[PDB]
């Protein structure tokens, strides 16, 4: 039930197998080689037999040899199943996330997506391969010891796995209960830390109120009792180690005593108490990394927890189903309202707005609202709150979503060029229902193809960033090629802010005439040369529509046209 | 930077002795006890059979306590250090940062001044400390482990005092260059990451041309090599760890084969060797920890180098240095130009305005575009880039700024609360001046009796870390009474109310009636009533004014007044 993700990992359970072979091999290695201790001091340096130190350095390097191959291999094999089961779900979480609503994706995660691709994914894999080394590797090492010690000292052996259980819970105890304490102060050093922010964040009344003076005194007082919390925090950190090192040291010495009194015991040789004892220095290791086995698992499948709370999240609803190809009914608002998914002010109030079929109505103003959130609606990346947008005679919640984005393009200057070629990019999705023919016709009508041509191969060319990096202006010639592949009767123009382009806005607007030969145009004007030729106006403010004239008749409530 | 820092450290010279001086025992604790090996193989379970195995275990605990006991000392002393360092460190960072202009406030470092007051100072006493640590403690321990070789067996301690240098450069230089490799790995996969995130950045324009299809396979192919660049990175770094063992393990490989010769044996007991191969097996880990002090004693210094470049940055400008303590003069706006820090497009375009003395001049921006950025230019929180404010007949440049400071008074909805009493966050950097009287006073004027009533202690009521929870009425009501009690005579109300509550805004309608009676007052506006009341009318857009008289007057183009 805490895994959900043995599924994702089946496939690949052969470099699991294969990496808990090689941990094996990894923490008998070590083990044997504390085992050469023994002819080492009892065949060597015991009883005079140098031909056993000829060998005892081959054999040294012989083992440790095997530990580095192996150590070599089970990362290369665990780093495999979690670069592959990492790959996975790197790619379910993509699939997915191109699927959510934008409304999700829009400022309630932004840049912390990359994070769950990369860095959160990362850390699921990373953290249960940890746990899975900590807990074969270190396991096995434990076991290995444990046989080795009952080979050549089962009395010490049996005093070992009576206190080992013993000094195994004395270390975790302890661990958890100055942890407690720590995190404990930790929350005090937040606390303190907190008010140290308080102090900075009114900086512009400590100028006029006064001075830095009595701030200055205040946050000695602030930063004193940081030093005070911060030595406590570092004495409770430090005062843990020694603890367990010190229990440690008394089942050494209980082990050693062990040793002492018992006659019956100590017919040990030289070799077997060092193998013995060197086994209780290589035990204190795994020892401490079984205890904080778990934690790390639990940390690992938290942050996997997390990245499946987004991966089962709820995506974007398709419930409508009316299939449109070249719809030339035309989109109409009737008191449609929209508030911000974040927010509680509706940007849009009732529109009533009704855009005819083949004309270029377009809207006028920085309304800081839901001018531009127009656009969002006619397209669906936001869903409309209430009200009905009504084109071709069908609610837009009737329409499939894969249909009615095909219907409408939308012309900006902030593009995403793909990074693909020009000529993919420039006909993107449906790549092969438009042949470069189609693409080099496009090119010519979009009054584009002279600096698409010129650029380097031509329409072949990588267009994506770290690249040629064609510019804004180009960015919006690019765009509009892409909508003079038309299958998109539905025009939404962004017309940024039209930062002269030029002989490019020239062919912006001849080019605006080309679509608007047929599409009906939705244009969020920011230039008057749009309103000009502009069949319609209708202004908005602040969410709310003052006028529904056009430029000359509009003139009757100026404002601000002339500017 | 540790030229510059050891001043701030020297004072507390002691910690750092006592400190060092425990981790030299630390360092001799562990030694001996491995020492005590040769006693254990020897006068134990070598010659003599007995009567050492009770001496030994007391010995062993004993050492142990002193290591514990020598461990806890140094961290306690070391962090006394650090925190009587950081605190110094802090204490000067915050004084210069409460100095310095709202400008290095404002966007060129935001509230993450608290990390560089929190985290970045903490670093640097981190990583100096630590790095003491391992200086003093492990090159104690390698000054030790060699020194016990040395006593036991000076033939073997040659071969190794010969090849610990070897060993050493060894293993610095295959850390050099598996980091060096690693590097370059990281860049690449950050490469890709970067690719990752301009996937992830075109949302909108894959759902608009329904590109998922393609999105996911380019994502299949950059995922897949993500993953090929995980597991090279991986195997580069973990390449590292198997052959710096294997030098290792060559080194003694080629002692212990030295020990077969026999010159060498014939004197190697089975303690003696024993000791020998203990202290080789613990001279591991210093070598790494010297690698590590030389890695961690640049990294704090790059910290503190970050640190002392905002410590010693520019300050605010104090060149003016007439004093003004009643300022009943008119101020003037006379041809006037402000830009923004960090943009290039004036907030506030070249205008002229008058500030009459004793007159309620209302400003009036909707937007906001170069409305507020009046009232930061009267208490120079951004310096003016082009005209002179001529309060008083003089340029604020020639003012002193504490004094012009304490002429004007900013009021605001958004003032925040000092961590202090109530009684002296009514009156800051004043409360050892005016007396509780004059707060009686002030509370009265106020028009805030319920509001301090509703505090407990009433008037010596602790508004700390939230306590009271003051709202922006009540907080209003506190800032108007601290502008009562200083007496400013100039004021400047931002009015960021906007018509919330009755008895907060009668409240602050009768308080600017007691103030502005007999008080000028740059009043930016959002309630059309303060702007009814108000004598001239200075209506405000894009940085430029528009309409500049009386509600009834300017009302033939009204602008912003039917909003
Ligand atoms: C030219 C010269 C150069 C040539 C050199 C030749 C060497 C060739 C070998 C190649 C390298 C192999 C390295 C190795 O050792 O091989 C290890 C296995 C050895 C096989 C090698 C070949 C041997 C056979 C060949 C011989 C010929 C046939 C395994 C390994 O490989 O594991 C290595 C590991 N070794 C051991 O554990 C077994 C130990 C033991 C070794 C066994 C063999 C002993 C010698 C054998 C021959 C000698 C006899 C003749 O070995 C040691 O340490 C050295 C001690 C030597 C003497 C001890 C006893 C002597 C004999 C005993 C009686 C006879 C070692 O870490 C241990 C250190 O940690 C604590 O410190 P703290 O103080 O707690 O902070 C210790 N405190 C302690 O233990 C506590 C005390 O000491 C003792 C405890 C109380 C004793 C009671 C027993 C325990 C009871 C348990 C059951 C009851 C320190 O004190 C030291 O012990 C040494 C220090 O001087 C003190 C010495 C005094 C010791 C006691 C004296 C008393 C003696 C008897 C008294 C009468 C000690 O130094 O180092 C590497 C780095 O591991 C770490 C790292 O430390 O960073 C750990 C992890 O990191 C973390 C963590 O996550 O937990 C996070 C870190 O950020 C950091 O926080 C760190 C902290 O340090 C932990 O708190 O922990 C991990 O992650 C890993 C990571 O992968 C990065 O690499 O890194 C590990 O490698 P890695 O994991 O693979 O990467």
Redesign the interface.
């Known amino acids: 039930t805490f895994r959900r993700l043995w599924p994702t990992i089946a496939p690949f359970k052969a470099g699991l197998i294969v990496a808990g072979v090689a941990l094996i091999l990894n923490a008998a290695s070590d083990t044997f080689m504390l085992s050469l201790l023994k002819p ?2 009892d065949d ?3 009883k005079t037999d ?1 031909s056993v ?2 060998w ?3 054999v ?2 012989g083992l ?2 095997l ?3 192996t ?2 291999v089970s ?2 094999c665990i ?2 199943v979690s ?2 089961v ?2 996975t779900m ?2 379910r979480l ?2 997915h ?3 959510m609503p ?1 409304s999700f ?1 829009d400022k309630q995660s932004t840049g912390t ?2 994070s769950r ?2 860095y959160d994914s ?1 850390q699921v894999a990373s953290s249960s391969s940890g746990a899975l080394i900590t807990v074969v590797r270190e396991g096995a090492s434990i076991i290995g010891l444990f046989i080795m010690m009952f080979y050549y000292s089962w009395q010490l052996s049996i005093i070992l796995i009576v206190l080992a259980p013993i000094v195994s819970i004395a270390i975790r105890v302890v661990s958890k209960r100055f942890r407690n304490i720590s995190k404990n102060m930790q929350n005090t050093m937040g ?1 303190v ?24 005194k ?3 007082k602030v ?2 009792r ?3 919390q ?2 406590k925090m ?2 409770a ?3 843990s ?3 367990i ?2 229990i440690a ?2 089942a ?3 082990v ?2 062990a ?2 009194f018992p006659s019956v015991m ?1 017919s ?3 070799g077997t ?2 193998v013995v004892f060197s086994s209780m220095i290589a035990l204190m290791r795994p020892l401490k990394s079984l205890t904080n086995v778990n934690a790390q698992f639990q940390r690992g499948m938290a942050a996997c927890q997390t990245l499946f709370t987004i991966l089962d999240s709820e995506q974007e609803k398709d419930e409508g189903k009316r299939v449109i190809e070249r719809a030339t009914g035309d989109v109409e608002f009737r008191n449609v309202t929209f508030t911000y998914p974040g927010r509680d002010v509706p940007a849009l109030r009732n529109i009533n707005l009704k855009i005819p079929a083949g004309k270029t109505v377009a809207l006028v103003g920085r309304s ?1 609202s839901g001018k531009s959130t127009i656009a969002s609606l006619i ?1 669906r ?1 936001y869903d409309i709150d209430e009200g009905e947008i009504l084109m071709d005679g069908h609610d837009l919640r009737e329409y499939t979503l ?1 249909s009615l ?2 219907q ?3 012309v900006s200057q902030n ?2 060029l ?3 070629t020009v000529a993919n990019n420039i006909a ?4 092969e229902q438009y042949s470069r023919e189609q693409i080099e016709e496009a090119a010519r009508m979009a009054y584009a193809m002279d600096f698409i041509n010129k650029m380097d191969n031509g329409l072949d060319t990588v267009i ?3 690249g040629v990096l064609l510019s804004g202006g180009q960015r919006q010639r690019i765009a509009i090629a ?1 909508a003079l592949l038309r299958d998109s009767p539905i025009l939404i123009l962004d017309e940024a802010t039209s930062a002269l382009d030029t002989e490019s806005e020239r062919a912006i607007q001849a080019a605006l005439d080309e679509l608007q030969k047929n599409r009906t145009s939705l244009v969020i004007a920011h230039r008057l040369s749009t309103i000009e030729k502009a069949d319609e106006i209708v202004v908005v403010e ?1 969410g709310v529509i003052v006028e529904r004239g056009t430029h000359n008749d509009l003139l009757e409530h100026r404002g601000v046209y002339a500017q």
């Open positions: 080492l001091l060597g340096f015991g140098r130190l000829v005892m350095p081959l040294v390097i440790m040899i530990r580095g191959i150590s070599y990362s290369y780093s495999w670069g592959k990492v790959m790197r790619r993509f699939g996330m191109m699927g934008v994706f997506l990359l691709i990369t990362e606390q830390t907190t008010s140290a922010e308080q102090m900075l964040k009114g900086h512009k009344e400590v100028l006029i109120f006064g001075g830095q003076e009595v701030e200055t205040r946050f000695d930063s004193n940081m030093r005070l911060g030595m570092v004495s950190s430090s005062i180690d020694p603890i090192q010190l040291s008394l050494l010495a209980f050693l005593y040793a002492s100590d040990l040789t030289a108490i060092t800081g397209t990346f894969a984005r095909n409408v393009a939308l593009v995403h793909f990074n693909d993107y999705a449906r790549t994506g960033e770290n892409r602040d």
